[PDB]
Ligand binder design. Structure first.
Ligand SMILES: *[C@@H]1O[C@H](CO[C@@H]2O[C@@H](C)[C@@H](O)[C@@H](O)[C@@H]2O)[C@@H](O[C@@H]2O[C@H](CO)[C@@H](O)[C@H](O)[C@H]2NC(C)=O)[C@H](O)[C@H]1NC(C)=O
Ligand SMILES: *[C@@H]1O[C@H](CO[C@@H]2O[C@@H](C)[C@@H](O)[C@@H](O)[C@@H]2O)[C@@H](O[C@@H]2O[C@H](CO)[C@@H](O)[C@H](O)[C@H]2NC(C)=O)[C@H](O)[C@H]1NC(C)=O
Ligand SMILES: *[C@@H]1O[C@H](CO)[C@@H](O)[C@H](O)[C@H]1NC(C)=O
Ligand SMILES: *[C@@H]1O[C@H](CO)[C@@H](O)[C@H](O)[C@H]1NC(C)=O
Ligand SMILES: *[C@@H]1O[C@H](CO)[C@@H](O)[C@H](O)[C@H]1NC(C)=O
Ligand SMILES: [Cl-]
Ligand SMILES: [Cl-]
Length: 523
């Protein structure tokens, strides 16, 4: 199975899936390897080749630090790279239904990982179930992360910032220019991603250069207005400079700083990324998106508020316990191996861990808002998790959706509350950040693994996501399902996703978000 693309021929492989077949092209290059003088620069166009490029295995993952907090534990290791790390990592994957489709809608996945980690080859991102079951084409790309992907010297093409976002953009262009040859419709492309991947999707909604590269968008647990999503020009300068010093690259000429950094080995750069910030948190994004004046022309909050974004439909959602996952990466008294009952003192120490540069008054205000107990030994444990989840994910996703829908477009919001029967993390962590992904990709449809109720749930989510991509409406129209209403600034209706009963509810976390969205930004 050979497909002719603009830059050359590529050969795929046949996969058997649910008594059917899917053709996969894993590892197609979409840009010039960003090595040597190209390190830290925007991705460059790829020169044609002849011969047949074999896209039969996942390519290298981009350089990045790995989570070594729990060696041998599947809960954490399932997110680590499963392919060799390398600066030569600008590749993408394509899964297409078989027989070849005639004008299939295209879903483009952008992985998360705090803009410091991640890769498109993870098992939970395998696009073969969606291609098989919904007959859509699935594309996913690797983009640069960490300093190699986001180091910034605003204005300087040697390291302008947002390089990883331009990698994503160049892959979207590849789809525009080449997907028809695979039987895809470039006029029906939906971006979807989770966490930093969702934040990325939201930035493409803001970037004029990405406007014509896609049709609709799905944001799972993330948006650019989240507090960890955009690095300020101030922080970025201090960070690029701290990295320079830590690697012996400080120099009067900034362009000389970059030349020096280009001689360091990826490992010396990775090793020092951690220390570029005086005091970080388990949610630190040392090197992330910045207002570079190219991909992003102004502070995103201003663009959102003033309606400067691509006008189209959006599907946005969050999980019930977004914050718990981070508590075991630094909050005192927490452990994935016991019930983590903490005390008021520990809760207070926890706030210090998650809100390092916050005034004492700021922290007390968080404590006052979350400790008006409705006794229960797990009050403080549960409160710190909600504090972290509301501030970092839920409230920002809700504000993004409200502000976006005020300009006229249909928006749909979900609250995912099902805890995987297979979750390796303890029960107290609940419906964790990242654990809706396997349902969206259809892993529970594979019986060889999950309960019957999960197969059904995953089946409905898959259908709703596909209907959103193809038709701009996330409904499951055949099995007497709850209709998903549009989210409007007034009523604020949202759909809950679970195995029990799906319900229409209103004003998710109203009281908590008024605190984070209106008040807290002032302290
Ligand atoms: C901007 O960076 C300075 C410098 O950071 C230090 O040096 C870097 C190379 C790196 O190794 C960091 O870990 C160091 O902290 C920050 O200033 C530091 O502030 C802390 C406060 O706790 C102090 O203990 C250090 O001595 C200071 N570093 C020095 C030697 O001046 C500064 O905090 C950063 N600016 C911001 C955003 O606050
Ligand atoms: C839950 O465990 C934490 C973490 O302790 C580590 O992991 C445990 C499972 C066990 O193997 C310990 O020996 C490990 O050190 C406990 O938190 C520690 O508590 C002690 C005393 O309160 C304190 O001195 C340490 O600083 C704490 N460590 C951390 C990371 O906070 C916690 O007490 C346990 N809670 C329970 C059993 O409910
Ligand atoms: C690509 O795959 C074909 C068929 O498997 C093989 O003949 C060819 O040598 C491969 N090209 C390489 C390894 O460069
Ligand atoms: C695919 O459908 C689009 C409309 O969405 C149409 O413009 C295009 O011509 C179709 N592509 C094919 C099958 O040629
Ligand atoms: C609808 O119901 C049928 C049979 O009752 C079931 O097999 C199928 O998975 C359901 N389809 C969706 C999209 O949930
Ligand atoms: Cl490992
Ligand atoms: Cl239902």
């Amino acid at each position: 199975i050979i497909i002719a693309t603009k830059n050359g021929k590529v050969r795929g492989m046949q996969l058997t899936v649910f008594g059917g077949t899917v053709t996969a092209f894993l590892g197609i290059p979409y840009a010039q390897p960003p090595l040597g003088r190209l390190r830290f620069k925007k991705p460059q166009s790829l020169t044609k080749w002849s011969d047949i490029w074999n896209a039969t295995k996942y390519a290298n993952s981009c350089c990045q630090n790995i989570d070594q907090s729990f060696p041998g534990f599947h809960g954490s290791e399932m997110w680590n790279p499963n392919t060799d790390l390398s600066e030569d990592c600008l590749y993408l994957n394509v899964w297409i239904p078989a027989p070849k489709p005639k004008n299939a809608t295209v879903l483009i996945w952008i992985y998360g990982g705090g803009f410091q980690t991640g890769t498109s080859s993870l098992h939970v991102y395998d696009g073969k179930f969606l291609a098989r079951v919904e007959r859509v084409i699935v594309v996913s790309m690797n983009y640069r992360v960490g300093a190699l992907g986001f180091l910034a010297l605003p204005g300087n093409p040697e390291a302008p910032g947002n390089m990883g976002l331009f990698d994503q953009q160049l892959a979207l262009q590849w789809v525009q220019k080449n997907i028809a040859a695979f039987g895809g419709n470039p006029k029906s492309v939906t971006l979807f991603g989770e966490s930093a991947g969702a934040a990325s999707v939201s930035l493409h909604l803001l970037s004029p250069g990405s406007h014509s590269l896609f049709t609709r968008a799905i944001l799972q647990s993330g948006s650019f207005n989240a507090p960890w999503a955009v690095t300020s020009l101030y922080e970025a300068r201090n960070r690029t400079l701290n990295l320079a010093k830590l690697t012996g690259c400080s120099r009067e000429n900034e362009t000389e700083i970059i030349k020096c950094l280009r001689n360091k080995d990826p490992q010396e750069i990775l090793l020092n990324e951690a220390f570029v910030v005086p005091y970080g948190t388990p949610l630190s994004v040392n090197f992330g998106p910045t207002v570079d004046g190219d991909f992003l022309t102004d502070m995103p909050d201003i663009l959102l508020e003033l309606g400067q974004f691509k006008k189209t439909q959006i599907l946005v959602g969050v999980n019930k316990d977004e914050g718990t996952a981070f508590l075991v990466y630094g909050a005192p008294g927490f452990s994935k191996d016991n019930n983590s009952i903490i005390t008021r003192k520990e809760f207070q120490e926890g706030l210090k861990i998650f809100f390092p540069g916050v005034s004492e008054f700021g922290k007390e205000s968080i404590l006052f808002h979350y400790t008006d107990w409705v006794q229960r030994p797990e009050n403080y444990r549960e409160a710190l998790g909600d504090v972290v989840g509301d501030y970092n994910f839920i409230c920002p996703a809700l504000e993004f959706t409200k502000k976006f829908s005020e300009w006229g477009n249909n928006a749909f919001f979900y609250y995912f509350e099902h805890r995987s029967s297979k979750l390796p993390w303890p029960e107290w962590m609940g419906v964790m950040h990242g654990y809706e992904i396997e349902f969206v990709f259809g892993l529970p449809l594979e019986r060889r693994d999950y309960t019957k109720a999960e197969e059904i749930l995953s089946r409905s989510i898959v259908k709703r996501w596909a209907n959103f991509a193809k038709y701009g409406n996330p409904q499951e129209t055949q099995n007497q399902s709850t209709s998903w209403p549009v989210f409007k600034s007034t009523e604020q209706k949202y759909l809950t996703l679970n195995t029990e009963s799906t319900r229409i509810m209103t004003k998710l976390r109203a009281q908590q978000c008024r605190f984070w969205t209106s008040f807290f930004p002032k302290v």
